[PDB]
Amino acid sequence: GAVLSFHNICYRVKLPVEKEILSNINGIMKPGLNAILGPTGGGKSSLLDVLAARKDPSGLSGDVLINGAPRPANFKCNSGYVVQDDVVMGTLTVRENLQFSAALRLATTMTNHEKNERINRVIQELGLDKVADSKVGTQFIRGVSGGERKRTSIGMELITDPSILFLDEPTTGLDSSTANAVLLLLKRMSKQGRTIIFSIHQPRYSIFKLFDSLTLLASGRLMFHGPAQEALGYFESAGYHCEAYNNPADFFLDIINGDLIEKLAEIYVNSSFYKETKAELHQLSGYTTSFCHQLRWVSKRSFKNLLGNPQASIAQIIVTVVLGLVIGAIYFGLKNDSTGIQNRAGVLFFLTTNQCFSSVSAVELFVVEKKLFIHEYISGYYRVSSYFLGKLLSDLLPMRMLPSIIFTCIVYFMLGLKPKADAFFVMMFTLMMVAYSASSMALAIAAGQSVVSVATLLMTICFVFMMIFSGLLVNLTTIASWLSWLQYFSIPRYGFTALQHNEFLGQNFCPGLNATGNNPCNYATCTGEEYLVKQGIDLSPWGLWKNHVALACMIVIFLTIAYLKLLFLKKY
Amino acid sequence: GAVLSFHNICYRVKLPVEKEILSNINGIMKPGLNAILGPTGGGKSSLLDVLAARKDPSGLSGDVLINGAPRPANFKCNSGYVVQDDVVMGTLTVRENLQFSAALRLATTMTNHEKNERINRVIQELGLDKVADSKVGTQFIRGVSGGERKRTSIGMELITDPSILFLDEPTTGLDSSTANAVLLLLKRMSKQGRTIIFSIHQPRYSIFKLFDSLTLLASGRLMFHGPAQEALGYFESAGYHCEAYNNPADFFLDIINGDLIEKLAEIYVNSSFYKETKAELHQLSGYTTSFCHQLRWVSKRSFKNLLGNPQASIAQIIVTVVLGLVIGAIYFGLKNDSTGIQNRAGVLFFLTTNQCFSSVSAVELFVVEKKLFIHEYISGYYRVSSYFLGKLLSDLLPMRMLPSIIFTCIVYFMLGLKPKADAFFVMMFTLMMVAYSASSMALAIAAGQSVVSVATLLMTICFVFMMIFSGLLVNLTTIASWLSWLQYFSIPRYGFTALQHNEFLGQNFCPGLNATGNNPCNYATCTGEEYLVKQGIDLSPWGLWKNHVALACMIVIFLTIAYLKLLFLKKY
Numbered sequence A, B: 001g002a003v004l005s006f007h008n009i010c011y012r013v014k015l016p017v018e019k020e021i022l023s024n025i026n027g028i029m030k031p032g033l034n035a036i037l038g039p040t041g042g043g044k045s046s047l048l049d050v051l052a053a054r055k056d057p058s059g060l061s062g063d064v065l066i067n068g069a070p071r072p073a074n075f076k077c078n079s080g081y082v083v084q085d086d087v088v089m090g091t092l093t094v095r096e097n098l099q100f101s102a103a104l105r106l107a108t109t110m111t112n113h114e115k116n117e118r119i120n121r122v123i124q125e126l127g128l129d130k131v132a133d134s135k136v137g138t139q140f141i142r143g144v145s146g147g148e149r150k151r152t153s154i155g156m157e158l159i160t161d162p163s164i165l166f167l168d169e170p171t172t173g174l175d176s177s178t179a180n181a182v183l184l185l186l187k188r189m190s191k192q193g194r195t196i197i198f199s200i201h202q203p204r205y206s207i208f209k210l211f212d213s214l215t216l217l218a219s220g221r222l223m224f225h226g227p228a229q230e231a232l233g234y235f236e237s238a239g240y241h242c243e244a245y246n247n248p249a250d251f252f253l254d255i256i257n258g259d260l261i262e263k264l265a266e267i268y269v270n271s272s273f274y275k276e277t278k279a280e281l282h283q284l285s286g287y288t289t290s291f292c293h294q295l296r297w298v299s300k301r302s303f304k305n306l307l308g309n310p311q312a313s314i315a316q317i318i319v320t321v322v323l324g325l326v327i328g329a330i331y332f333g334l335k336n337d338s339t340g341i342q343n344r345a346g347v348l349f350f351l352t353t354n355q356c357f358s359s360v361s362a363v364e365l366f367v368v369e370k371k372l373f374i375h376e377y378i379s380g381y382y383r384v385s386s387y388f389l390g391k392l393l394s395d396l397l398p399m400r401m402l403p404s405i406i407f408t409c410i411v412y413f414m415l416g417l418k419p420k421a422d423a424f425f426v427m428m429f430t431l432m433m434v435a436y437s438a439s440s441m442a443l444a445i446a447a448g449q450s451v452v453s454v455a456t457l458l459m460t461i462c463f464v465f466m467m468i469f470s471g472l473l474v475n476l477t478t479i480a481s482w483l484s485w486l487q488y489f490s491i492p493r494y495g496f497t498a499l500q501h502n503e504f505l506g507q508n509f510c511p512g513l514n515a516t517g518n519n520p521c522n523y524a525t526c527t528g529e530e531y532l533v534k535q536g537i538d539l540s541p542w543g544l545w546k547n548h549v550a551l552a553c554m555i556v557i558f559l560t561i562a563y564l565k566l567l568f569l570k571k572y
């Protein structure tokens, strides 16, 4: 098996206040089962991220060396890593998660039969054969238990057959017998020859008896490294008395807590386990798949997540149908009189600002899947471009095509707007474009963040500063010229101007008029063009289509900003 | 000290699926230190809530009897209880929390000097004298450490000098040496003669050596009850071998988990610790303060929380000032021409719907303080009426007086609305009333819930169904008569109709007119009354003030519904 042998690791971060969180740590990890103990504030998870190259090589100041050689560039694609909180797809089943991982991690050369036999072998080694085709589970659907979720998360990284297998906290978040079952599974894996390296948090003695090698850390300093049976005898030789009926790992943490660390670290420097470790270390020292493949599998997984998550996709269509029927019931039969201007301008304003505010629910998209994106980009399933285009083609495109089609098909013929063939399609296309543009601004603000609330609030602030310049509330010509340049940044202004220019052309709003008051008395606003001029809207068809080309340019700019915020994200 | 002696407790709930979660449990708890162990799904916290009467007496089916007598009605006011997650005020300091608890729990007869000496004695017994006047801590301000938060939460219930002191999970959420310090403090309390009863979760042996009496529970059934030293010897006599270097409490849980419960519970029936327990049990068996006082102290605490939480109170005023300057910059100098109707109706619609949507942030009020309200109502600090009126007088009144005054004083004179003395005050009062009414609907929907998101979403749905019937988007006379009755339920319609009737009276919107087109040609909308009639608004001053009396009636109805949802809440 592999022998991961790290020597003289110094590590430091910038919080810019610079601080070392690993001081001077060396150790050898045999084929077998290696554990890392310590407090939460100690460097256990930090050293585990360092050995798997999950933290940046800028702060790292020592050689990490496997089997006599430094770590190659293919190492992250070769060595599996299992996150603390499970990153499995809750809506997909256990076999389709392994199908996804086998499709992206393994080569394109292999047969589907070979990958299916590999998945069957991995799901046989885990004991997930009873639940091989059930869903993993979310809030709405009941699913598989938590220990078998953890076995699924291990089995996703077992597909590529890793030589070294890392594990961040496999015990925590679980109950006791569940944790014992997971660790017995890990011991059955380690007896084969696979080198398991894991960090944990306050284990039991039934856990602690299984360990092959131990590494204790405290406040960034190495406290012990050797065989795990030898550790209690070493701390008896240090002078700390162990009491009867006490867990030795709890005794190890009780040494740290003080019933000092610079006093206790130097005691390990004067050990027999330290000179032997240096005597071993100085002996040793002195993409895969194409683009369309990744886009196809990412889009397939995200669309299957969209189907398997019923409520957040169905309820938007239900509220769209209900609100379309309500707007068809309120504005039913739009007349041509003095109320016609107010009713038509009001319903077009409601439809555009409805599209904008209903596109706030795409903040959720790149924020819920953020840790899964980071883990699967470091583990090397996909590029950022394929993730981005697949998740636009999967979750953004149909869930913004369907509500605008439903709004136009419902509120068009109940209201009785301009009864032409092409005005219907221009209205449908304008609602679709304002939906895409508002949702693209949502993705531009929301991408690369961890919380939903600040991005949602900022979307709503931007929309209430856009709807002032939309054109119904204020007249755009009466804004002062040092402030009227902000009307070009606003998506409802383009959607609403396009709908007003679509609908107000052939209409007359003074019945029985036939020039009674001599082109009626200069204050009438009778024909639709006379309304559409004094709003500041052009009458030429470029005055229609420049709104759509402005929306298309805002879609392109906002999706490019979202892509750059995903690409320039701190992945480590 | 007190001897809490419970006998033959049977307990069951309705989830309506009926299920027993405590089967047949009896035990005696001496003056000293009593611990309750078990799994999470076992009845440890349920039995601890039963003994402190924190669960309803409907499901309870056995006598709980202290010191030879059943529990009186004053018992909850006499025996302290400490919640798992701390319910201390994060923005108040450690001395003012104890001042609050001493003001509400103790009598009105006692001197302020006596209560201050009691607080000094309690804060001396805890070891909080170094941090006696520092703030406890929230997200924005750094504060006291978590163990000293837990000591503060214990000291809040130590004020009334309880004979019996309960504790739900004093170890969890903490680190190891912190938990050992808290439990050594508890042992120093228990040596005085105070009867401490607590539930915990997987303790250490340094914890477990301190116990005076033990009660193990599993799946609703009693597993052991006796002295805690005797428990390991009893389970050796049962036939379960304990291994060396193993925590006995972890061994107790490992017996439960199965390395059955109906097999193992009957073994305790055949004990020597069970017949002795029955031989002891059958021997034994066979507001404070006025209303204005509670309202004053609750309002004082909530106002000090409003000051000590800076950002959520200051940032609303900052965004109000910024948005008032923006609306004063866009709508600057409202002219009297064909654009005057559109600009005035637009800015009045923006102001009213701004008041409505800015009153969504009072959903937070009764939802963040929900567990603190439940704990302090059961422990008996205040009635529901005093809590409700104090938290309306503290957080609702000034944070809705200030933004409406700021909006009116900024956007009034920059826009140049109706330049009178009383129109300014009618506008300020109408914005204040629409703020109160929207926020009262927020309190009516939000009170008695635990999550913020569903209540916030429902507030926003109600507001977007109200702003259609406000009157700018649709004309209210052109709505069909089977659906035009919904316009009376909408708060922006009353605020916006009152502002339009306030501002559109003395205005003329056709310059240089002087009857050129013979009362100009029937389609002009020149004078303000001609606009204000065709919207459906009365011209008499009752057409102004009926909007304000409708807003006052909606304030009264919504605050009454919020009070009934607080009063009829399931407190157990």
Ligand SMILES: CC(C)C[C@H]1c2[nH]c3cc(OC4CCCC4)ccc3c2C[C@H]2C(=O)N[C@@H](CCC(=O)OC(C)(C)C)C(=O)N21
Residues within 6 Å of the ligand: A315, A316, A319, A320, A323, A349, A350, A353, A354, A357, A358, A359, A360, A361, B457, B460, B461, B464, B467, B468, B473
């Ligand atoms: C679809 C609508 C009922 C809710 C939608 C929405 N329209 C708005 C339109 C606005 O214009 C104003 C109307 C008069 C002039 C301007 C202003 C605000 C809004 C909002 C709120 C917004 C939101 O808060 N987010 C999603 C919620 C979708 C959801 O998940 O909720 C269900 C019920 C579970 C499906 C949304 O679509 N709305």
Ligand SMILES: CC(C)C[C@H]1c2[nH]c3cc(OC4CCCC4)ccc3c2C[C@H]2C(=O)N[C@@H](CCC(=O)OC(C)(C)C)C(=O)N21
Residues within 6 Å of the ligand: A457, A460, A461, A464, A467, A468, A473, B315, B316, B319, B320, B323, B350, B353, B354, B357, B358, B359, B360, B361
């Ligand atoms: C204050 C304003 C900028 C945000 C406010 C608000 N106005 C609205 C007005 C609306 O009329 C439409 C205008 C054209 C026709 C109808 C519609 C929606 C809104 C919203 C959103 C709402 C919100 O989502 N939340 C609260 C508190 C937010 C907050 O506390 O923000 C800081 C930055 C932390 C201080 C709010 O104030 N807004």
